[PDB]
Symmetry: D2
Subunit: 366 residues, 4 copies
């Protein structure tokens, strides 16, 4: 065709996750929980009211199959999710914060399936790139456990699909959610065929992983790369890490597909991090990935929603990425003049030191 | 025996979107009363209330407000939520009266709306009247005190308090805050007062990402020695909890144990230099999950009764902020050089 | 064409109304206001997740023009709405409960425009019928005043459009929101070219109108018909009123178009009425209108959202109407077995008496 | 002088969607604590608290619960919100103790969770333990009373209370409710007790749409003469406000003035026949806007202090329900024939 085609995966069901649920400890009940669907729903609704949807190609998600999940997760993980989802009131699963409503496994299948649908249509050439605004998120789900709001690891399920079904030999997952993608790291730990990169706040969540000396094992040694930035890092540190480490690592690896785990909890207003990224930072991060993807594999890249918890500001951070994909700047970030003066734009010595240490790991990528 | 606690149901009755900019309306606004209400409710369900002396607030008068604010500010406020603003400032006065008189040793005034951004001329940043400056002016003008210290550990800069006492050495104003957080263009170390007040305003603008390590170091290296140097007859703490590791309106990493130690250091120096005449007045804070435990930790520092554990203690202890970083210590040491002019 | 075409008008902006805002009276502030967008948004989202959207033809609304509004409202009403919408914080307008956010007049134009778009496509034959899930509502807006959450009178603006632009000579507006359509009654009070029918709880809102002896004036005498049912009426009274009064009145009048003002606040769970209609009642009401429309004007009818305040049950009441239009029963009402035993299904003597008095007014319709 | 008021912060700390049925999750559930919390807060900001005697609740014991409930119910409840259920029943006991002893004349226990649907065997309808039946059993077994009356004007049928005292004439159980509202299959006039209890359960199932007219007529024609006939030594009122004109869980039209008159009629007959020994225990109610004014109206009936107007008085006065309709009066007159067997 002769149309610029940027895919957008959304489904009302992604906003229907049951995020509902100690007195002895005098922990008073919360009604509006941290992972409430409002935050990501406001992002979807801004895509629509900003007019960006007029430049996007809506892509209907279809459920991932059990076989799609079993490519990267244990049968026990899947059996546990089916069991909890079948309970009359649903329940928690994996850890103390991850919850399934009754029947909620359907949304988890559809979230993974949305990442697969975007992957299929990008690899086929039907779409140049796109954004999958899926819920629930994925990157903390390991081979063995759901956790951290993540039932199934959507980006890893997409990468395995691209490998097994679409013939790809090298995939890179670049995770810029502010928390460590420990699930993705675990799944591909011993596998050089998926380069796994996580940039995150050092020791944020999980508090015990994401360190720079977690580099893979066996055939996978050197094919996991963690960038654990200090609290308070903003656009300066993030853009420097993308230009000094992530882009050069991708060029060295030559992935046939780049899957971005796109969270916005590194934003300056997110409660679940101390990072200071603005919408302008996220726009640049997205643009750097699109550019290096065009350079090394003909633009085969796509973005899949992970975390983010600011209902005020996440919609504008997500829109900035969308506008980087469409080339259409239709709406201004209304916080930019206040957030820009708050700090984070300048690269600090301690931030630069971490990134430069991470840069030394690129030599072991082949 | 006598720790005062100022609360009133009306403090929880406090009552910007733009469609052309596609800013979708928010139902639950940032300063919603739930967060401070959950603090009060934890004071009761924890049993801490059994060690506190409840203190009824009474409305501050127009003359109370006009000791520090211009008529134009008060007329703007009048031209019916002003009732709660009066009662908030009135609660700070009530606690101040009862500490100075000797009825109470110390106490906490969980008031709303907050105060430290209100300057002589303008209300701003959720603040109608400057509660702590109104209580200090009352202590000076009605109760006869010559020197008051206001120590503001809300994570934002106390620009209102700085402005009110800018040219006045009879109120030492100290603000520790995240550099450039709010307001974005104030709170720098070179803002030191003017005239007779030169040297009697002290800003500690810590970098984003600072935690217990930087905060405790700042208190032991700067704030406590500044207080010893100044010899205040009363210490009023502007106690916000928005430096907490979960607060959306800052990037700092203070834990409930950090706020406890911060309160302890103030009580300890007060006990040593002015008979323990100190009190704590609520400023900001926006984490419904975590602010109640930060506030309780300060209460427990006043009552000496540890009745409840912070459920996050193991979590945040592994997240960092507890080590003093070199960039943090350099800012603090710079500020410490300013004490020689007090 | 050879496709069954049932239109569905929705726009994200309809869920963006600012429903935000006394201490002396010790009236404690409410955070989640009565007219919060959640209720009607849950109806839109159930249209999507129930699969009903697959049988619907999405119709994009376009803004009504000032001229469309000025066909039925005073210039002062429109000037007031523009003034309030322009204020930095918006403000109340008309009465003490009707609120505009900053820029909120755009949603009011788009709500009226959605009713116009459905009217155009039904009259043209592009659609057989359809449902416009617009917000804000319309039926309390008079010639002179916005009120009762209603900025502009959407169904009257649509009827006037159909008359002035599309050539129609007779239109009927049938209003089954549980409150009296006093705005619609006022606009067409002296006009026999729009038959205005309101069925509502007697004395609910406005408390001082909706009575059976309000029948129009002048050329309009006998061309306004109020059915003020007693509190506690349910399916029995409503279906009887539709079969004994509303359907015969429409047959006598022979409208070229039937516009339904479709509220669901007569439902058994709505806080703003004491009525007991179930989803099955609303399904029958819709079906009776579709049937009489097919009999007398070739199916030229359409439904436009008015009120409703139960987030639990309004989605299932609205879906029941949607399913009556599509012919596709894809989802069960999960309350039907409990609501059905609660009363309201039986026609009571006092309910029948009111309806029969209303039936005597049909003789004056020509 | 002595009107008791039972409240505890924990009563406001009380902590169904199905995706295959496309029932979208609800965040703010029907029994959210805001509604009853707003009632408590209006008691304070209205100044009514200044005329009340605060009464601290204490936990009801297992033996308190087992006077009316089976072990299987209590074991199901145990197998940590049960703490609040204990404290709710305990608050009803505390008020009962203090009324019977003479320390207080009357009072209101604003407890949560509610109680009247809990039968001997099963918790249900938001009710864990039957608070009013636990207080009546305490009054009988511990305090020696021979006759108790429980008058339940929550809009739903008190099936739990009916079940507990079904075969017992020593507790006269009266429920006025919307016919077939909840549970949908109980509350009919032919449910009159069994055995020694035959004639000592009295249901008044009013039709949907009933308002002040039917409710006041029912109280003057049935409930008050039933109480005079029975001569209770204590009157316990199960006070719900879900018959209010704005409640989503009923179709009745009672206003705040209707609840005031209802409370007044009970206090008046109590003052005449058992020394005023009556008390009021919170049951249901779901209108955050209007329930606080309905509850305050009952408080004002106990204290005799009208400090605040109902902001809806003019609105609802024009909405009807105030006239007694023929279908309503026929139900009431039918129920009145049942008094001859008390
Ligand atoms: O974006 C992501 C997200 C990864 C997962 C991050 C985990 C987020 N934690 C929560 O939501 C959370 C965890 N505990 C709690 N309470 C809690 C904490 C400790 C013990 C018991 C409860 C809590 C609950 C109610 C009130 C107050 C509190 Cl303290 N409340 C919320 N990954 O990429
Ligand atoms: C033991 C396994 N749980 C965790 O490690 C865990 C769970 N929740 C949290 N946060 C959390 C806790 C309570 C409420 C909301 C979030 C948390 C706290 C501070 C900073 C960032 C975060 Cl996410 N942090 C860690
Ligand atoms: O603790 C303290 C606090 C002092 C005060 C700090 C300022 C707090 N700002 C807000 O609450 C605030 C400011 N704008 C906004 N929106 C906003 C931003 C830019 C333009 C227009 C509106 C906003 C509103 C609705 C939805 C989304 C957004 Cl973005 N929303 C919230 N001092 O000690
Ligand atoms: N006017 C201002 O300068 C102004 C107004 N709001 C804000 N924040 C703010 C803006 C929107 C929503 C909530 C808060 C803000 C943003 C990031 C970090 C800290 C803050 Cl307080 N920041 C400055
Ligand atoms: O569907 C429709 C809807 C027609 C319009 C129906 C009007 C609906 N009234 C409200 O929303 C409303 C009206 N007053 C009030 N408070 C109120 C009542 C009287 C005086 C002052 C305020 C109120 C506010 C907060 C807390 C408690 C209360 Cl009492 N609170 C809500 N038409 O078809
Ligand atoms: C004077 C002009 N205002 C009204 O007539 C008016 C305003 N609000 C209301 N309701 C209302 C009042 C307060 C909160 C919510 C709704 C109302 C009350 C009972 C039944 C139905 C409704 Cl709608 N009822 C009437
Ligand atoms: O005051 C009293 C009260 C006594 C108890 C009366 C019963 C109260 N029912 C509920 O709260 C209730 C019951 N089901 C439901 N959903 C429901 C209905 C049918 C099937 C499954 C769920 C529901 C849940 C979420 C969203 C939408 C819906 Cl429809 N949602 C709420 N007694 O004195
Ligand atoms: N089980 C039941 O019988 C049952 C459960 N919920 C309900 N209501 C209910 C159902 C869903 C949401 C909220 C309440 C109910 C419905 C209409 C009128 C009154 C009520 Cl209480 N009604 C019965
Ligand atoms: K790997
Ligand atoms: K990451
Ligand atoms: K000074
Ligand atoms: K400060
Ligand atoms: K007419
Ligand atoms: K109507
Ligand atoms: K009995
Ligand atoms: K009852
Ligand atoms: Zn994250
Ligand atoms: Zn602050
Ligand atoms: Zn209505
Ligand atoms: Zn009830």
């Amino acid at each position: 065709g002769h149309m610029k085609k940027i895919g957008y995966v959304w489904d009302t069901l992604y906003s229907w996750v049951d995020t509902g649920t100690n007195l002895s400890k005098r922990i008073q009940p919360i009604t509006h929980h941290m992972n409430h669907p409002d935050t990501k729903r406001r992002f979807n609704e801004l895509v629509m009211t900003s007019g960006q949807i007029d430049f996007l190609t809506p892509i209907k998600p279809y459920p991932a199959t059990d076989a799609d999940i079993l490519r990267v997760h244990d049968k026990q993980l899947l059996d546990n999710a089916k069991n909890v989802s079948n309970k009359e009131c649903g329940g928690d699963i994996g850890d103390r914060v991850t919850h399934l409503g009754n029947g909620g496994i359907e949304i988890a299948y559809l979230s993974a399936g949305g990442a697969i649908e975007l992957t299929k249509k990008v690899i086929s050439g039907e779409l140049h790139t796109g954004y999958a605004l899926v819920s629930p998120p994925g990157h903390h789900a390991t081979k063995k456990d759901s956790m951290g709001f993540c039932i199934f690891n959507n980006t890893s399920i997409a990468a395995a699909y691209a490998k097994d079904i679409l013939g790809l030999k090298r995939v890179a997952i670049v995770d810029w959610d502010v928390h460590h993608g420990n699930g993705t790291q675990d799944i591909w730990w011993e596998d050089s065929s998926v380069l796994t990169i996580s940039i995150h706040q050092n020791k944020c969540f999980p508090t015990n992983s994401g360190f720079i000396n977690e580099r893979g094992a066996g055939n996978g040694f050197g094919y996991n790369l963690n960038i654990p930035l200090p609290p308070g890092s903003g656009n300066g540190a993030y853009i420097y890490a993308f230009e000094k480490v992530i882009v050069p690592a991708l060029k060295k690896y030559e992935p046939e597909l780049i899957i971005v785990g796109s969270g916005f909890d590194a934003s300056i207003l997110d409660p679940l991090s101390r990072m200071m990224v603005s919408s302008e930072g996220f726009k640049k991060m997205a643009s750097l990935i699109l550019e290096v993807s065009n350079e090394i594999n003909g633009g085969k890249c796509l973005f899949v929603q992970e975390g983010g918890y600011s209902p005020h500001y996440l919609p504008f951070c997500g829109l900035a990425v969308i506008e980087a994909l469409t080339g259409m700047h239709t709406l201004d970030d209304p916080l930019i003049d206040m957030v820009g003066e708050m700090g984070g734009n300048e690269l600090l010595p301690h931030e630069k030191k971490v990134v430069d240490e991470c840069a030394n790991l690129i030599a072991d990528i082949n």
